[PDB]
């Protein structure tokens, strides 16, 4: 049992405050928080190669990477960035991002497989950490 599976969110904490740090106005933050209640993640892991598909009711993106190899994605607020994933431990990885253009808050994410079958994702902007918890569908 590795990261592979179809994961459905059961809990999201501090997501609105993450988007506030990132400059989203209140009305869209509330609509984004509602959209995150349908957040789903599909993972296929082969070694340190990861295929990820993150989706909501009306949107879906893919985001494939290999640990230790730089790649391009977008920050949570949508700005292009270059990213590098490393292991922290057997079942936790950390990704550091650097903006491709301009400046902005410092952003990163983590994924972790817990002993109790949960997937925990965090997303960070400066001081503020959002935590989302998933279970296998
Ligand atoms: C390893 C995990 C990854 C690459 C996931 C990143 C997640 C996002 C960029 C999520 C963004 C969201 C919005 C901007 C609006 C509300 C719904 C979300 C959670 C899909």
Swiss-Prot record:
Q: How does it assemble?
A: Interacts with RXR and RARA. Interacts with importin alpha.
Domain-related comment:
Forms a beta-barrel structure that accommodates hydrophobic ligands in its interior.
Cellular component terms per the entry's GO annotation: cytoplasm; cytosol; endoplasmic reticulum; extracellular exosome; nucleoplasm; nucleus
The residues that the entry says bind all-trans-retinoate are: 132-134
Name one matching Pfam family. Answer: Lipocalin
Please state the gene responsible for encoding this protein: CRABP2
| Record family assignment | Belongs to the calycin superfamily. Fatty-acid binding protein (FABP) family.
Task: Describe its function.
Answer: Transports retinoic acid to the nucleus. Regulates the access of retinoic acid to the nuclear retinoic acid receptors.
What is the name of this protein?
Answer: Cellular retinoic acid-binding protein 2
Q: What is the lineage of its organism?
A: Eukaryota, Metazoa, Chordata, Craniata, Vertebrata
């Amino acid at each position: 049992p590795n990261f592979s599976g179809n994961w459905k969110i059961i809990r999201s904490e501090n997501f609105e405050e993450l988007l506030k740090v990132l400059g989203v106005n209140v009305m869209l933050r509330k609509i984004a928080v509602a959209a995150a209640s349908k957040y789903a993640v599909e993972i296929k892991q082969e070694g340190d190669t990861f295929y990820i598909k993150v989706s909501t009711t009306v949107y879906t993106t893919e985001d494939n990477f290999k640990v230790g190899e730089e790649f391009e994605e977008q920050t949570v607020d949508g700005r292009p960035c270059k990213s590098l994933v490393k292991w922290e431990s057997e079942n936790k990885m950390v990704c550091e991002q650097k903006l491709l253009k301009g400046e902005g808050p410092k952003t990163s994410w983590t994924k972790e497989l817990t002993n109790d079958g949960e997937l925990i994702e965090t997303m960070t902007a400066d001081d503020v950490v959002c935590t989302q918890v998933f279970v296998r569908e």
